[PDB]
Design an enzyme around this catalytic site. Structure first.
Site, PDB file in Angstrom:
ATOM      1  N   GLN A  48       0.824  -1.203   0.000  1.00 55.28           N
ATOM      2  CA  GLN A  48       0.000   0.000   0.000  1.00 55.28           C
ATOM      3  C   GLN A  48       0.864   1.262   0.000  1.00 55.28           C
ATOM      4  O   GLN A  48       0.591   2.205  -0.740  1.00 55.28           O
ATOM      5  CB  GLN A  48      -0.937   0.005   1.210  1.00 55.28           C
ATOM      6  CG  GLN A  48      -1.996   1.098   1.173  1.00 55.28           C
ATOM      7  CD  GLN A  48      -2.795   1.182   2.459  1.00 55.28           C
ATOM      8  OE1 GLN A  48      -2.392   0.647   3.493  1.00 55.28           O
ATOM      9  NE2 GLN A  48      -3.937   1.858   2.402  1.00 55.28           N
ATOM     10  N   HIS A  74       1.170   3.642  -3.543  1.00 59.10           N
ATOM     11  CA  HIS A  74       0.385   4.863  -3.401  1.00 59.10           C
ATOM     12  C   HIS A  74       1.199   6.113  -3.715  1.00 59.10           C
ATOM     13  O   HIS A  74       0.719   7.231  -3.539  1.00 59.10           O
ATOM     14  CB  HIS A  74      -0.211   4.954  -1.999  1.00 59.10           C
ATOM     15  CG  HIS A  74      -1.515   4.234  -1.867  1.00 59.10           C
ATOM     16  ND1 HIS A  74      -1.683   2.923  -2.260  1.00 59.10           N
ATOM     17  CD2 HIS A  74      -2.721   4.649  -1.414  1.00 59.10           C
ATOM     18  CE1 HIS A  74      -2.933   2.557  -2.041  1.00 59.10           C
ATOM     19  NE2 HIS A  74      -3.583   3.586  -1.528  1.00 59.10           N
ATOM     20  N   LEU A 113      -6.128  -3.431 -10.704  1.00 60.47           N
ATOM     21  CA  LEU A 113      -5.745  -4.776 -10.286  1.00 60.47           C
ATOM     22  C   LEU A 113      -4.996  -4.764  -8.953  1.00 60.47           C
ATOM     23  O   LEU A 113      -4.881  -5.799  -8.299  1.00 60.47           O
ATOM     24  CB  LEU A 113      -4.891  -5.457 -11.363  1.00 60.47           C
ATOM     25  CG  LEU A 113      -3.460  -4.958 -11.603  1.00 60.47           C
ATOM     26  CD1 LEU A 113      -2.447  -5.596 -10.643  1.00 60.47           C
ATOM     27  CD2 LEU A 113      -3.052  -5.219 -13.044  1.00 60.47           C
ATOM     28  N   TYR A 114      -4.486  -3.601  -8.553  1.00 59.15           N
ATOM     29  CA  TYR A 114      -3.715  -3.501  -7.316  1.00 59.15           C
ATOM     30  C   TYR A 114      -4.591  -3.173  -6.108  1.00 59.15           C
ATOM     31  O   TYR A 114      -4.082  -2.828  -5.039  1.00 59.15           O
ATOM     32  CB  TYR A 114      -2.611  -2.453  -7.449  1.00 59.15           C
ATOM     33  CG  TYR A 114      -1.253  -2.981  -7.056  1.00 59.15           C
ATOM     34  CD1 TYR A 114      -1.009  -3.437  -5.766  1.00 59.15           C
ATOM     35  CD2 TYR A 114      -0.215  -3.032  -7.977  1.00 59.15           C
ATOM     36  CE1 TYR A 114       0.232  -3.928  -5.404  1.00 59.15           C
ATOM     37  CE2 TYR A 114       1.028  -3.514  -7.623  1.00 59.15           C
ATOM     38  CZ  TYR A 114       1.245  -3.964  -6.337  1.00 59.15           C
ATOM     39  OH  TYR A 114       2.480  -4.451  -5.984  1.00 59.15           O
ATOM     40  N   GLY A 144      -0.090  -7.847 -14.230  1.00 61.56           N
ATOM     41  CA  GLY A 144       0.576  -6.938 -13.315  1.00 61.56           C
ATOM     42  C   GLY A 144       2.079  -6.849 -13.498  1.00 61.56           C
ATOM     43  O   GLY A 144       2.654  -5.767 -13.365  1.00 61.56           O
TER      44      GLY A 144
END
Ligand code: COH
Ligand code: COH
Ligand SMILES: *[C@@H]1O[C@H](CO)[C@@H](O[C@@H]2O[C@H](CO)[C@@H](O[C@H]3O[C@H](CO)[C@@H](O)[C@H](O)[C@@H]3O)[C@H](O)[C@H]2NC(C)=O)[C@H](O)[C@H]1NC(C)=O
Ligand SMILES: *[C@@H]1O[C@H](CO)[C@@H](O[C@@H]2O[C@H](CO)[C@@H](O[C@H]3O[C@H](CO)[C@@H](O)[C@H](O)[C@@H]3O)[C@H](O)[C@H]2NC(C)=O)[C@H](O)[C@H]1NC(C)=O
Ligand SMILES: CCCCCCCCO[C@@H]1O[C@H](CO)[C@@H](O)[C@H](O)[C@H]1O
Ligand SMILES: CCCCCCCCO[C@@H]1O[C@H](CO)[C@@H](O)[C@H](O)[C@H]1O
Ligand SMILES: CCCCCCCCO[C@@H]1O[C@H](CO)[C@@H](O)[C@H](O)[C@H]1O
Ligand SMILES: CCCCCCCCO[C@@H]1O[C@H](CO)[C@@H](O)[C@H](O)[C@H]1O
Ligand SMILES: Cc1cccc(Nc2ccccc2C(=O)O)c1C
Ligand SMILES: Cc1cccc(Nc2ccccc2C(=O)O)c1C
Ligand SMILES: *[C@@H]1O[C@H](CO)[C@@H](O)[C@H](O)[C@H]1NC(C)=O
Ligand SMILES: *[C@@H]1O[C@H](CO)[C@@H](O)[C@H](O)[C@H]1NC(C)=O
Ligand SMILES: [N+]
Ligand SMILES: [N+]
Ligand SMILES: [N+]
Ligand SMILES: [N+]
Ligand SMILES: [N+]
Lengths: 551, 551
Positions: free
Chosen positions: A171, A175, A352-353, A494
């Protein structure tokens, strides 16, 4: 629009001709024919000689004894790693092409950095169905899809043993380039660097950076709480952050990324990298007593970018892949290869993440348990236990499995729904279309997708046709690989986006990949010896053991 | 600062170590030693086998009958041209490195698009000399250098025969990426596209583009005056322009570039390209009756970008080079080579393109004589004679020689001085350093530079040391090649920048370079059969003959 059926195969470009006809451009696809469906001479050969991804995956995840040998033959390991980089990166167009507003090439789509780019063009405006021609006239209720297929009933743990250090690293790291600009729409991003620029540490703009820097010894501002270094606050920096009213002002830490106060897991890594930056300033100072604050800061930033890419490949992706082959961060592998040192973040990469199934039902720090109401936006927890306890606890707590369906925590249920809605706003093509885009065989039945009867049955009732299943739902209900966290499509779609964002970085270009870029050999060495363990060891009190999987 | 002397040779990177030592990073330079002055074995062979620029020039500018047979053999022409591209391009760092504020690699310098980039790092802030160590503490007076070396006495024609169609094409074309932001300083640019995006036609921002577009049939707004198409007014578009108060509202033409109202020569080409865009819209409409205004506009822009690159290579550079080898615009030549499809405009490329000696003492339109007082900001002159008259006249009038010194018109005298003063603002290194940077033996004497006794004496008087001579002055006073417009250094420093800006364009990348990108074979053919003559023939009444050389 005749292109609504997506007639062109194998990366052929569909173009309308008149009101009733289409033309497929088969240039350099390796195919020909009306729909670019007929393979060429050389294309039949490579296709015959190419094992399925699942076969390759089995090989890379077995024969431990074999790979132990390969991993210690440098000429071989380099050739393999080099091939992984080049082969996967061929799947990404660079410079980029489409975005949400352009299903044809245009200067606006190329030049405007505020858009996420697109691996597949959007479904054209006026089509029979939302996805083109397949499926019903309306898509199923998104709230129903989440409850029926994605909502967690029983927590399913990750068989690969992924922990909370892994989940929160994922995360935190992603981000910095998944920064959806919702005041404009899901098609837009605030991450204009479009990659690994560590803006989530230093800020997206010079104005924000200046608010966070100490302007002494190249360092970043910080506080000393309970004898340990922590980020500064909004008040001290005047650097804006997203905090709800509840959170008292003195707990409103200010870091590069405006949303990282959301969860203490993010603030943990924010703290660790902050320490790392200032630690590297000290090293560089010892190396260059003649240097000023500016060159100390800038040089340290380049170091940490290097550390990040190093760690992401050789620890993060290494664990994620489950490979016995030892991945390598080494820009020199590409200096004799064709490769573009640039990147544009794809919207589908963002979608997809959304790995929210990773999240546990409660967060366990030391001997205490926290639900989402207590844990979210609560930096008191971080200060209570400290970073060392956080690392030790998170290293031990198992993460949830991502593929396999029905494992999204109810606390973030609405996030899954929004992910679906937003993908519909951006007119994503179907899941099977994205399979084909990345050289995967399209699924022929719902049972084939899930490898199961319950959800595949639910799916058939909701979509009707397998070619109508959407990207995001299918990714989370797809059959996991044997004792794997993900299914085939997650990995195969991915991996290209990821490696392109990593090796596409400017520091990997031959002009930058020099010790002088990093203040000499000492600086260069910090990058090339970085690991997730050494990151924790150098900046966390006690140098606790850590890893991306549970001990 | 030990690096003030520029110790490191052959692209080696200098770094300070302590307060009194320096280290040279010789990585990948092909050299080693304290200063990267010792060539490797292979380097020595290459060094021995490489013909000097003056040799490859002589060959390409002679043997006319030989080149005709080469030019008609594809395999041979393609191989030659392919080498032309790769050889020059290796001299440019891509992605970019330094700018005016950064003499070391940094993320600020890489990422901040508002800076011109720098082929050579700026001189450190506190060196013995402003150029480093070489020269007097103070630089020679800017005014004297202009008067003594650059200011025109009698108009010197161009031996290569360059006309005003060439002089104004150069100003128009280059001013899409030379957009110096004097609000911020000479180190900054408004051309964030950093290349051939034709923002000087369509506007830099989407907001300005919307003001110029018709939003019908993909076309741009225009006026019909005297039965011919001209650009629209500021009043009809609200697209601001730079005009003095004197200019009447009805003559305030609005085009992409704010400054193109400054001379009718610019407005002529602005008009011609405007006609070309709308002409291409008609073609695409016939090809695609189903297309909307948006796709019509965007596809036309991509076609005009390709047109521009086609023309610049095979007509503009083709003339400037004086080569008998037929240059070719063919993106396919690079698809097997290592090449970065990206560009960043170098400040030195800006400085060197200050070709104001091209300008005449008066401008001859039809049968009249205009001086700078009556020519500048006079759009009525354009409407008087019209485009066809402007073309016919400018095709006939000769341009001034750029190299050789003393050929800058008194009107643009202050400009020539400003070009020098700003070079010092941005801390350019010496002329000889830039010689080495582009693999040219540094000049040993002032007479070797000019190949002449008078100006060389003035230079030695002003500078003293040959290594104290500045980039812009030396470029103008340098010995012109035999009956050529430029000297050795202009061509060898300029060509790499130019070709990078041309082939580094996204449309040259394999994903873009295909007929579907340009609406099909028809649109594609417009690019691949474009030329300066065809440009005028298709958009100028009477289809007058034109060329970049006087007949
Ligand atoms: C490993 C991946 C990961 C993790 C662990 C994670 C962990 C957590 C977490 C607690 C640990 C919480 C409370 C949330 C909650 C949210 N996440 Co994530 N998220 C993750 C991947 C993402 C991504 C990717 C986005 C979209 C980013 C964007 O567009 O800015 C996202 C967006 C969100 C949003 C925005 C919703 C919207 O409407 O756009 C919320 C709310 N979430 N997530
Ligand atoms: C072939 C090249 C060419 C031509 C024909 C040309 C033709 C003409 C011309 C009449 C035909 C006039 C009156 C001028 C006069 C000027 N030129 Co040029 N210029 C040219 C190359 C340049 C370049 C390059 C710049 C710098 C652009 C920037 O940074 O914005 C420039 C800038 C200028 C400026 C900016 C002021 C300053 O501080 O330098 C003026 C004034 N000029 N030029
Ligand atoms: C690219 O580099 C530019 C040059 O440094 C930079 O512009 C500079 O930006 C800073 C901060 O925005 C300006 O400083 C500001 O300082 C006070 C706050 O203490 C403000 O109140 C001032 O109004 C001023 O804006 C510099 O003046 C400015 N320099 C210029 C314009 O020459 C850009 O921001 C950089 N680009 C990015 C995307 O970061
Ligand atoms: C990149 O694409 C963005 C989306 O198209 C674009 O934003 C859009 O910009 C236009 C013009 O600036 C805005 O329209 C404006 O229209 C009126 C004038 O009639 C203004 O008064 C309004 O305030 C409004 O700003 C669009 O609203 C805006 N669309 C968004 C934000 O979704 C960017 O400008 C593009 N970037 C570049 C560099 O061109
Ligand atoms: C070019 C290198 C090829 C050598 C690896 C051959 C791997 C053989 O593996 C085979 O692959 C098939 C599909 O891929 C599977 O159906 C078989 O079960 C499997 O045995
Ligand atoms: C060189 C030695 C080749 C070994 C290849 C072994 C192929 C194993 O077979 C693989 O097993 C997976 C399930 O575990 C399946 O999902 C794959 O479809 C299948 O190819
Ligand atoms: C903390 C995140 C950066 C990790 C980089 C590795 C730093 C680990 O520690 C380093 O090990 C080196 C051994 O080669 C020693 O030379 C260094 O003194 C030591 O700090
Ligand atoms: C206007 C600048 C771009 C010129 C593009 C080519 C102009 C020549 O003209 C074109 O020649 C073609 C014949 O080959 C015809 O098919 C086209 O109809 C004609 O417009
Ligand atoms: C090589 C390889 C193998 C398996 C997974 C990955 N990477 C990803 C795959 C799917 C999703 C994300 C990633 C990633 O690294 O972020 C890689 C790079
Ligand atoms: C191949 C070649 C040979 C000589 C000159 C050029 N080009 C330039 C040289 C100097 C200055 C400008 C240019 C240019 O194309 O703009 C080229 C591309
Ligand atoms: C935040 O955490 C502290 C413990 O550090 C706890 O006492 C407090 O109740 C938490 N806040 C909420 C809203 O649960
Ligand atoms: C502009 O040109 C016209 C002729 O086209 C001329 O009459 C007028 O005097 C010129 N303006 C100036 C200021 O010289
Ligand atoms: N398979
Ligand atoms: N800020
Ligand atoms: N909760
Ligand atoms: N404007
Ligand atoms: N004049």
């Amino acid at each position: 629009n005749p292109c609504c059926s997506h007639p062109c195969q194998n990366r052929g470009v569909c173009m309308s001709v008149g009101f009733d006809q289409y033309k497929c451009d088969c240039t350099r696809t390796g195919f020909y024919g009306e729909n670019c469906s007929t393979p060429e001479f050389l294309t039949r050969i490579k296709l015959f000689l190419k094992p399925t991804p699942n076969t390759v995956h089995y090989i890379l995840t077995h024969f431990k004894g074999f790979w132990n040998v390969v991993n210690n033959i440098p000429f071989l390991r380099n050739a393999i790693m080099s091939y992984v980089l080049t082969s996967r990166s061929h799947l990404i167009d660079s410079p980029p092409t489409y975005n949400a507003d352009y299903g044809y090439k245009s200067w606006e789509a190329f030049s405007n950095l505020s858009y996420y780019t697109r691996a597949l063009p959007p479904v054209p405006d006026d089509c029979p169905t939302p996805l083109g021609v397949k499926g019903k006239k309306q898509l199923p209720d998104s709230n129903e899809i989440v409850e029926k297929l994605l909502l967690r009933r029983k927590f399913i743990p990750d068989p690969q043993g992924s922990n909370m250090m892994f989940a929160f690293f994922a995360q935190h790291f992603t981000h910095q380039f998944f920064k959806t600009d919702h005041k404009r729409g899901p098609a837009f991003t605030n991450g204009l660097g479009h990659g690994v620029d560590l803006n989530h540490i230093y800020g997206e703009t010079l104005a924000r950076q200046r608010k966070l820097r100490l302007f002494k010894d190249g360092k970043m501002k910080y506080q000393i709480i309970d004898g340990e270094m922590y980020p500064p606050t909004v008040k001290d920096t005047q650097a804006e952050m997203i905090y709800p009213p509840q959170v008292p002002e003195h707990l409103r830490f200010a870091v590069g990324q405006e949303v990282f106060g959301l969860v203490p897991g993010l603030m943990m890594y924010a703290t660790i990298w902050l320490r790392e930056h200032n630690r590297v300033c000290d090293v560089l100072k010892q190396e260059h007593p003649e240097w000023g604050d500016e060159q100390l800061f800038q040089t340290s930033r380049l170091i940490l970018i290097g550390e990040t890419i190093k760690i992401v490949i050789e620890d993060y992706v290494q664990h994620l892949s489950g490979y016995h082959f030892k991945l390598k961060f080494d820009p020199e592998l590409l200096f004799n290869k064709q490769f573009q040192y640039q990147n544009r973040i794809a919207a589908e990469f963002n979608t997809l993440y959304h790995w929210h199934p990773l999240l546990p039902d409660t967060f366990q720090i030391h001997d205490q348990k926290y639900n989402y109401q207590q844990f979210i936006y609560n930096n008191s927890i971080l200060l209570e236990h400290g970073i060392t306890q956080f690392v030790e606890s998170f290293t031990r707590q198992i993460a949830g499995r991502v593929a396999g369906g029905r494992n999204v925590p109810p606390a973030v249920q609405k996030v899954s729904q929004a992910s679906i809605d937003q993908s519909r706003q951006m007119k994503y093509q179907s899941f099977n279309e994205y399979r084909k885009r990345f050289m995967l065989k399209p699924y022929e039945s719902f049972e084939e997708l899930t490898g199961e009867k319950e959800m595949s049955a639910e799916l058939e009732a909701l979509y009707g046709d397998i070619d109508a299943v959407e990207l995001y739902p299918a990714l989370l209900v797809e059959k996991p690989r044997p004792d794997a966290i993900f299914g085939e499509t997650m990995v195969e779609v991915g991996a290209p986006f990821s490696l392109k964002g990593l090796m596409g970085n400017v520091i990997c270009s031959p002009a930058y990949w020099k010790p002088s870029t990093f203040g000499g050999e000492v600086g260069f060495q910090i990058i090339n010896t970085a690991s997730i363990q050494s990151l924790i060891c150098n900046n966390v009190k006690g140098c606790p053991f850590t890893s991306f999987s549970v001990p």
